[PDB]
């Protein structure tokens, strides 16, 4: 149970394969509700993401503050992992406990490509967080003229 | 330079000093390290 | 970064609009002070 | 008491009106191109 999580955090492939091959819960969650997919998306281990999804890892698992692997990957600029998660059924409009969506996070960092991918997959451009702010608002406040356009 | 003289005016004098050494003394001088704003009488925009 | 300093929120106007630091200031990495211009053969220089 | 004052007000006024202020310079650095004047600005100085 726990060997999978730190294996996925470390980015140790064959280990992970041996652990589902030996029966490790792909949906095992640490104390803050992070799953191996959360950890792999966070640190950016694209191949691990594919292997856990190939093995039935909940693509929409959420941690104790409502955040999903897609949030992590959008936030930190892991474009290919965003694509993979989205092709495997990642909820493009999932909201964490703050109302924040992957589009908000990707917008906040300026990851133009992720924003376009999320939009192509149906990201609600008008979704508001708990403060009433949309990805457009974020782009204005940041001064990002390139992003402010696409939105 | 005189009282009240500005940094830009000192810089033109220093640029002429630099130019002299690197042309009229091209054979003897390897470099001129010019500091605009402090001198041995004190500091200030009119010193270099 | 300069971008983060620029979005410091100074004021929220009556009509709900926002006054940011970049609306009243230019923001750049610069020196702590500008009293000394240093040149080496007429090019910008630092040193030790 | 006659003027509705306390020693707090006296202390505040002394700190504000017996003060030595740093006020920068006319033509201070970094300056505008073509500046011709550089002078210290002298604002409040300690009482004597």
Curated annotation (Swiss-Prot), chain B:
Signal peptide region: none
Induction: Positively regulated by MarA, Rob and SoxS transcriptional regulators (at protein level).
Domain of life, per lineage: Bacteria
Compartmental location: Cell inner membrane
Observed effect of gene inactivation: Loss of susceptibility to contact-dependent growth inhibition (CDI); inhibiting cells still contact the target.
Assembly and interaction partners: Homotrimer, with large domains that extend into the periplasm, interacts with AcrA and TolC. AcrA may be required to stably link this protein and TolC. Interacts with AcrZ. Part of the AcrA-AcrB-AcrZ-TolC efflux pump.
Function statement: AcrA-AcrB-AcrZ-TolC is a drug efflux protein complex with broad substrate specificity that uses the proton motive force to export substrates. (Microbial infection) Involved in contact-dependent growth inhibition (CDI), acts downstream of BamA, the receptor for CDI. Its role in CDI is independent of the AcrA-AcrB-TolC efflux pump complex.
Sequence similarity: Belongs to the resistance-nodulation-cell division (RND) (TC 2.A.6) family.
Protein name listed in UniProt: Multidrug efflux pump subunit AcrB
Record organism: Escherichia coli (strain K12)
Gene field: acrB
Swiss-Prot record, chain D:
Shown part of the complete sequence: 194 to 241 of 1049
Gene this protein is translated from: acrB
Entry protein name: Multidrug efflux pump subunit AcrB
Described purpose of this protein according to its UniProt entry: AcrA-AcrB-AcrZ-TolC is a drug efflux protein complex with broad substrate specificity that uses the proton motive force to export substrates. (Microbial infection) Involved in contact-dependent growth inhibition (CDI), acts downstream of BamA, the receptor for CDI. Its role in CDI is independent of the AcrA-AcrB-TolC efflux pump complex.
Highest taxon above the source species: Bacteria
Induction: Positively regulated by MarA, Rob and SoxS transcriptional regulators (at protein level).
Family: Belongs to the resistance-nodulation-cell division (RND) (TC 2.A.6) family.
Record localization: Cell inner membrane
Source organism: Escherichia coli (strain K12)
Phenotype on disruption: Loss of susceptibility to contact-dependent growth inhibition (CDI); inhibiting cells still contact the target.
Subunit and partners: Homotrimer, with large domains that extend into the periplasm, interacts with AcrA and TolC. AcrA may be required to stably link this protein and TolC. Interacts with AcrZ. Part of the AcrA-AcrB-AcrZ-TolC efflux pump.
């Amino acid at each position: 149970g726990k060997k999978l999580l730190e294996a996925a955090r470390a980015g140790r492939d064959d280990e992970v394969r041996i652990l589902m091959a030996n029966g490790a819960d792909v949906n095992a969650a640490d104390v803050v509700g992070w799953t191996p997919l959360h950890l792999a998306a966070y640190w950016g281990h694209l191949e691990i993401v594919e292997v856990l999804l190939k093995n039935g890892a909940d693509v929409n698992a959420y941690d104790t503050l409502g955040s999903t692997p897609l949030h992590l990957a959008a936030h930190f600029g892991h474009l290919e992992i965003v694509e993979v998660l989205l092709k495997n059924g990642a909820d493009v409009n999932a909201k964490d406990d703050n109302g924040i969506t992957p589009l908000h996070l990707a917008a906040n960092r300026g990851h133009l490509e992720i924003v376009e991918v999320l939009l192509k997959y149906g990201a609600d451009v008008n979704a508001q967080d708990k403060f009433g702010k949309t990805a457009f608002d974020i782009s204005i406040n940041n001064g990002n003229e390139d992003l402010a356009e696409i939105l | 330079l005189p009282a009240g003289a500005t940094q830009e005016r000192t810089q033109k004098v220093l640029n002429e000093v630099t130019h002299y050494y690197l042309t009229k003394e091209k054979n003897n001088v390897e470099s001129v390290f010019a500091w605009n704003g402090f001198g041995f009488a004190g500091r200030g925009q009119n010193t270099g | 970064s300069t971008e983060e300093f620029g979005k410091i929120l100074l004021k929220v106007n009556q009509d709900g609009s926002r006054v940011l630091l970049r609306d009243v200031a230019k923001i750049e990495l610069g020196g702590e002070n500008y009293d000394i211009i240093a040149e080496f053969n007429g090019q910008p220089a630092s040193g030790l | 008491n006659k003027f509705q004052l306390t020693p707090v007000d006296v202390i505040t006024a002394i700190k504000a009106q017996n003060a030595q202020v740093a006020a920068g310079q006319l033509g201070g650095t970094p300056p505008v191109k073509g500046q011709q004047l550089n002078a210290s600005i002298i604002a409040q100085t300690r009482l004597t």
